[PDB]
Amino acid sequence: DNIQGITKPAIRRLARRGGVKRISGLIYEETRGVLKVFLENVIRDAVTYTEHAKRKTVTAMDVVYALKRQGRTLYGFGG
């Protein structure tokens, strides 16, 4: 139950930065589900990258390559 550590206040802050004024009561479980799906995809790709290099540690470049594969390039952690 580590997805319940993404609390109600954190999701409210993430919604405020998106410009959201009022929130339903069923938004938090939906948000947890979508975050879980996104994280599963990215982590699967990253672990594939670490496995190819015959390593036991996941580095930041594996994450960067995985994100670039999903089409979600990120600046500031290498490349």
Partner 1 sequence: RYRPGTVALREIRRYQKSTELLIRKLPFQRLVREIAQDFKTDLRFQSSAVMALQEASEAYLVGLFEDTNLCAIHAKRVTIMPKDIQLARRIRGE
Partner 2 sequence: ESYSIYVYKVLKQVHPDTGISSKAMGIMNSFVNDIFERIAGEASRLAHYNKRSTITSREIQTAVRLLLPGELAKHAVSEGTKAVTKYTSA
Partner 3 sequence: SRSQRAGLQFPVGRIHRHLKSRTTSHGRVGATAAVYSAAILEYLTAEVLELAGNASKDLKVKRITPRHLQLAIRGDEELDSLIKATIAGGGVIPHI
Partner DNA sequence: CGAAAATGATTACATTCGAATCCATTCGAAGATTCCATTTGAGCCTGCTCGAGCAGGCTCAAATGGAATCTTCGAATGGATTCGAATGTAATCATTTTCGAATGGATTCGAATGGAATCTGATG
Partner DNA sequence: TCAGATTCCATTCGAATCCATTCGAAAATGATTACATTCGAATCCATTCGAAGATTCCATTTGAGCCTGCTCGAGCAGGCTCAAATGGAATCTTCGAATGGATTCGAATGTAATCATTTTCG
Residues that bind DNA (CB under 7 A): 5, 7-10, 22-26, 55-57, 59
DSSP state of 77: S
For residue 21, the minimal CB distance to DNA (Å) is 7
In the list 23, 32, 35, 65, the residue contacting partner 2 (rule: CB under 8 A) is 65
Residue type, 8: K
Q: 27 or 45: whose CB is closer to partner 2?
A: 45
78 contributes a contact to partner 2 by CB under 8 A: yes
- Token digits of residue 52: 């190819």
